[PDB]
């Protein structure tokens, strides 16, 4: 790849610069290069990887939703026929989104997950696997849609099982996993009751463990707890 000639440390340095410049496509490309060096990622480096791709795919998802809405409006009664362009451009954006998701899934499969033995790393990568299958599921309409949804579920569930055994209920990775899996249940799996139950139980179990935390850890955990509360408020 195009980053093969760049030092690992330089790729990481440049990813941090790209983040400061809000150049998330560049950030993602630097981080992909760093992963492809073959060494395990540190905590900081896992965060860089995730931030980069979250921001790239986030932008693509927002664009896809704009275009999908326009396309849906075009298919209503009384809408004038404007030709294939809206579908074509929605497809273009969709294909680019799918490409990014496939790139991330590829990094996780070759070989981040299999080398991840500590709970913090393994849960984090399995959560990411769930997230990128979820993004594929958002745009899926064909023969494989059920298998894509099941791939997301399986990844999230493996992450949940490890997190419950190995991490305290306030751990930010455990909380973030639960937040996202709850959204999977609500938005993808047509399971709003499961979504609500998971968010409520996660919040309550975290609340009960806050007493163990330093001020700084408390700030980190409570930030994500508020996201759980925000979703619960949206859904109830």
């Amino acid at each position: 790849g195009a980053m093969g000639s760049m030092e690992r440390a330089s790729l990481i340095q440049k990813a941090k610069l790209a983040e400061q410049a809000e150049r998330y496509e560049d950030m993602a490309a630097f981080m992909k290069g760093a992963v492809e060096k073959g060494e395990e990622l540190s905590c900081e480096e896992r965060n860089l990887l995730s931030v980069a791709y979250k921001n790239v795919v986030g932008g693509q998802r927002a664009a896809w939703r704009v275009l999908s809405s326009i396309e849906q409006k075009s298919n209503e009664e009384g809408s004038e026929e404007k030709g294939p362009e809206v579908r074509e451009y929605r497809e273009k954006v969709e294909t680019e989104l799918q490409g990014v998701c496939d790139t991330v899934l590829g990094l996780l499969d070759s070989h981040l997950i299999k080398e991840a033995g500590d709970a913090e790393s393994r849960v984090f990568y399995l959560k990411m696997k769930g997230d990128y299958y979820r993004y594929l599921a958002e745009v899926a309409t064909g023969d494989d849609k059920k298998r894509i949804i099941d791939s997301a579920r399986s990844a999230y569930q493996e992450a949940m099982d490890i997190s419950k055994k190995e991490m305290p209920p306030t751990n930010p990775i455990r909380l973030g996993l639960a937040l996202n899996f709850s959204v999977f249940h609500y938005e993808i799996a047509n399971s709003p009751e499961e979504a609500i139950s998971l968010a409520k139980t996660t919040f309550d179990e975290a609340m009960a463990d806050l007493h163990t935390l330093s001020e700084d850890s408390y700030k980190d955990s409570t930030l994500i707890m508020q996201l759980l509360r925000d979703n619960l408020t949206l859904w109830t």
Partner: peptide
């Protein structure tokens, strides 16, 4: 749209 991290 709901919050994710």
């Amino acid at each position: 749209f709901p919050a994710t991290v």
